[PDB]
């Protein structure tokens, strides 16, 4: 079994992923504690705390375990655990993305039309529930096809799609479209309007800078992540070309790093959050 590169590569990837998960849990817990304890606790902050919880669960349950799975590729978990990591972590990723989109939408509503009423307290709960259930419905195909196949010598691998690569390709096409294109289109169209409107004045432009930074980093981090999966789904022989482990590790690190971007910008932008963190 290959992908058992020496400890020098293991140490480097371990150091790279460990700081990422450490920040993604510590800062996210700080943010959620600030929101839910230092009342904060505002209806407009329901999206923020929901996104913080989604990012915390998308880090803790996904990045470290899939990292230890990527190198020394032995699935040190039961067959039931393989079903778990095809339903909850994936729904966490999708819920985080849709929470980002909803935050962009409600910021656009609050900036472009300040005098218009904000989202209702009940409406925020229903849209949060809709986001979560849509993510669950999207991740259910992953969980329902969570077979495990045992091999001699090494540990059993986690196969994904039995019904050929054609079915594995259209699913990834849908999962790239309505998870990377439409959300990014929404948070680009709304955020560019917000930036044009806000273009005292120094803060209203640093806000625009943060918005364009967020849009650019979302467009950059999540593109190779989906490219890897679509390439491995469309190319059967590419999944074992002696080097795919490093490519997956790099793309996965790039995508998983987004779990700590939000708490960093939430402290860099607002002074109260920075003081609470400090």
């Amino acid at each position: 079994n290959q992908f058992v590169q020496p400890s020098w590569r293991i140490a480097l990837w371990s150091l790279a992923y460990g700081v990422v998960v450490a920040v993604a849990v510590l800062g996210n817990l700080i943010v959620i504690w600030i929101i839910l304890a230092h009342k904060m606790r505002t209806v407009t902050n329901y999206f923020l705390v929901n996104l913080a919880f989604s990012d915390a669960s998308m880090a803790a349950f996904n990045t470290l375990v899939n990292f230890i799975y990527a190198l020394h590729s032995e699935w040190y978990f039961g067959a039931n655990y393989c079903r778990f990591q095809n339903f909850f972590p994936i729904t966490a990723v999708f819920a985080s993305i849709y929470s980002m989109t909803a935050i962009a939408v409600d910021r656009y509503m609050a900036i472009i039309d300040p005098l218009k009423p904000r989202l209702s307290a009940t409406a925020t709960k229903i849209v949060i529930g809709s986001i979560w259930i849509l993510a669950f419905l999207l991740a259910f195909p992953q969980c329902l096809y969570s077979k495990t196949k045992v091999m001699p010598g090494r540990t059993l691998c986690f196969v994904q799609w039995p019904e050929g690569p054609k079915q594995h390709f259209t699913y990834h096409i849908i999962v790239i479209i309505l998870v990377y294109c439409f959300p990014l289109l929404i948070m680009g169209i709304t955020y560019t309007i917000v930036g044009i409107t806000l273009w005292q004045l120094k803060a209203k432009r640093k806000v625009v800078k943060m918005m364009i930074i967020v849009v650019m980093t979302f467009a950059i981090c999540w593109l190779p992540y989906h490219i890897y999966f679509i390439l491995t789904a469309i190319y059967q022989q590419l999944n074992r070309w002696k080097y795919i482990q490093q490519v997956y590790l790099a793309s996965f690190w790039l995508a998983m790093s987004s779990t700590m971007y939000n708490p960093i910008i939430y402290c860099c932008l607002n002074k109260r959050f920075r003081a609470g963190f400090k």
């Binding site: 079994n1 290959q2 992908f3 899939n66 799975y69 990527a70 590729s73 699935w75 990591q85 095809n86 972590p89 994936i90 990723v93 992953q142 091999m151 691998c157 986690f158 196969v159 994904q160 890897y228 999966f229 491995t232 999944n239 074992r240 795919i244 482990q245 997956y248």
Partner: peptide
């Protein structure tokens, strides 16, 4: 066989 899994 001898291939890398992925698993999102």
């Amino acid at each position: 066989h001898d291939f890398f899994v992925g698993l999102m």
